[PDB]
Write an enzyme that holds these catalytic residues in place. Structure first.
Site, mmCIF file in Angstrom:
data_model
loop_
_atom_site.group_PDB
_atom_site.id
_atom_site.type_symbol
_atom_site.label_atom_id
_atom_site.label_comp_id
_atom_site.label_asym_id
_atom_site.label_seq_id
_atom_site.Cartn_x
_atom_site.Cartn_y
_atom_site.Cartn_z
ATOM 1 N N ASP B 25 0.899 -1.386 0.043
ATOM 2 C CA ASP B 25 0.040 0.042 -0.033
ATOM 3 C C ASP B 25 0.946 1.417 -0.065
ATOM 4 O O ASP B 25 1.290 1.805 1.102
ATOM 5 C CB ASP B 25 -0.890 0.015 1.107
ATOM 6 C CG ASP B 25 -2.068 0.939 1.259
ATOM 7 O OD1 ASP B 25 -2.137 2.050 0.074
ATOM 8 O OD2 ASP B 25 -3.024 1.171 1.788
ATOM 9 N N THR B 26 1.079 1.767 -1.242
ATOM 10 C CA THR B 26 1.731 2.974 -1.407
ATOM 11 C C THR B 26 1.102 4.128 -0.602
ATOM 12 O O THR B 26 1.584 5.325 -0.381
ATOM 13 C CB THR B 26 2.114 3.447 -2.847
ATOM 14 O OG1 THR B 26 0.743 3.489 -3.521
ATOM 15 C CG2 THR B 26 2.806 2.445 -3.363
ATOM 16 N N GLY B 27 -0.333 4.287 -0.280
ATOM 17 C CA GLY B 27 -1.032 5.405 0.441
ATOM 18 C C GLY B 27 -0.843 5.233 1.788
ATOM 19 O O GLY B 27 -1.309 6.113 2.441
HETATM 20 C C1 LIG Z 1 -4.737 8.943 4.269
HETATM 21 C C2 LIG Z 1 -4.574 8.209 2.881
HETATM 22 C C3 LIG Z 1 -5.133 6.908 2.941
HETATM 23 C C4 LIG Z 1 -6.856 6.937 3.459
HETATM 24 C C5 LIG Z 1 -7.438 7.899 2.420
HETATM 25 C C6 LIG Z 1 -4.430 5.905 4.047
HETATM 26 N N1 LIG Z 1 -5.079 4.479 4.242
HETATM 27 C C7 LIG Z 1 -4.470 3.425 2.917
HETATM 28 C C8 LIG Z 1 -5.552 3.229 1.809
HETATM 29 O O1 LIG Z 1 -4.605 2.457 0.881
HETATM 30 C C9 LIG Z 1 -6.545 2.289 2.440
HETATM 31 C C10 LIG Z 1 -6.314 0.894 2.681
HETATM 32 C C11 LIG Z 1 -7.487 0.088 3.106
HETATM 33 C C12 LIG Z 1 -8.037 -0.965 2.084
HETATM 34 C C13 LIG Z 1 -9.297 -1.692 2.324
HETATM 35 C C14 LIG Z 1 -9.894 -1.625 3.614
HETATM 36 C C15 LIG Z 1 -9.462 -0.440 4.854
HETATM 37 C C16 LIG Z 1 -8.210 0.267 4.370
HETATM 38 N N2 LIG Z 1 -7.411 2.221 1.181
HETATM 39 C C17 LIG Z 1 -8.783 3.129 1.343
HETATM 40 O O2 LIG Z 1 -9.061 3.562 2.145
HETATM 41 O O3 LIG Z 1 -9.374 2.781 -0.071
HETATM 42 C C18 LIG Z 1 -10.806 3.001 -0.074
HETATM 43 C C19 LIG Z 1 -11.379 3.781 -1.320
HETATM 44 O O4 LIG Z 1 -11.082 2.422 -2.493
HETATM 45 C C20 LIG Z 1 -11.506 1.243 -1.547
HETATM 46 O O5 LIG Z 1 -10.823 0.464 -1.751
HETATM 47 C C21 LIG Z 1 -10.393 0.136 -0.182
HETATM 48 C C22 LIG Z 1 -11.413 0.980 0.855
HETATM 49 C C23 LIG Z 1 -11.581 1.874 -0.106
HETATM 50 S S1 LIG Z 1 -5.580 3.929 5.426
HETATM 51 O O6 LIG Z 1 -5.985 2.529 5.330
HETATM 52 O O7 LIG Z 1 -6.726 4.588 5.923
HETATM 53 C C24 LIG Z 1 -4.016 4.044 6.720
HETATM 54 C C25 LIG Z 1 -3.144 2.841 6.486
HETATM 55 C C26 LIG Z 1 -1.797 3.196 7.685
HETATM 56 C C27 LIG Z 1 -1.599 4.438 8.429
HETATM 57 C C28 LIG Z 1 -0.584 4.704 9.337
HETATM 58 O O8 LIG Z 1 0.254 5.417 8.568
HETATM 59 C C29 LIG Z 1 -2.901 5.660 8.435
HETATM 60 C C30 LIG Z 1 -3.814 5.530 7.314
#
Ligand SMILES: CCC(CC)CN(C[C@@H](O)[C@H](Cc1ccccc1)NC(=O)O[C@H]1CO[C@H]2OCC[C@H]21)S(=O)(=O)c1ccc(CO)cc1
Lengths: 99, 99
Positions: B25-27
């Protein structure tokens, strides 16, 4: 380009004719942008992240340019903490992970 | 290897003597794993994303093996719905984005 990950992979995008900054997010299935005015019809949708579920406006078949690469696809608009480019558009620009 | 993004970029990881599937996860700034009982000291932390924040336990200097590549660094543990390998460890295994 080849992008290392010691910093956030932020890029400039163009959508609705407006430039914005966005995070290339391989962990996101979908592309989700902060609140903005976009032309065209939309439908209410729900999406789930690490902290729970939010309501978003789904815009279909939206033109969006990512570092000069054109994509046309679904863009969700809602209270996301950060503009994220998800896999639905990362695939369109030919993005891969490599190690 | 090279990983396309048609599907979720899930890979097998090894941590604390257990094999798990996790997202590249690059995000994600930092790595977050689903609830597990790790030994050692930790620090409370809250991390935010779509839907809000969750409370996690921050462990330092945790060894993780990602597709045979070893990496050691911060690992957060909490009620995440998915195991997430973040940039803090992706850089250590030589992972880059390319398009
Ligand atoms: C702040 C920027 C991102 C959120 C906006 C960060 N996320 C990583 C992201 O890849 C998550 C990782 C993720 C993947 C599945 C379920 C929960 C979290 N993906 C995500 O939220 O995608 C959503 C949009 O597309 C959909 O398909 C997946 C969920 C929906 S995160 O999970 O919330 C997160 C991860 C690690 C930390 C600590 O550094 C802080 C936040």
């Amino acid at each position: 380009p080849q992008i290392t990950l010691w910093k956030r992979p932020l890029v400039t995008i163009k959508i609705g004719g407006q430039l914005k900054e966005a995070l290339l997010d391989t962990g996101a299935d979908d592309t989700v942008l902060e609140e903005m005015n976009l032309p065209g019809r939309w439908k209410p949708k729900m999406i789930g992240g690490i902290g729970g579920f939010i309501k978003v406006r789904q815009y279909d078949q939206i033109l969006i340019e990512i570092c000069g690469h054109k994509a046309i696809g679904t863009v969700l608009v809602g209270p996301t903490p950060v503009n994220i480019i998800g896999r639905n558009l990362l695939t369109q620009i030919g993005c891969t992970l490599n190690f």
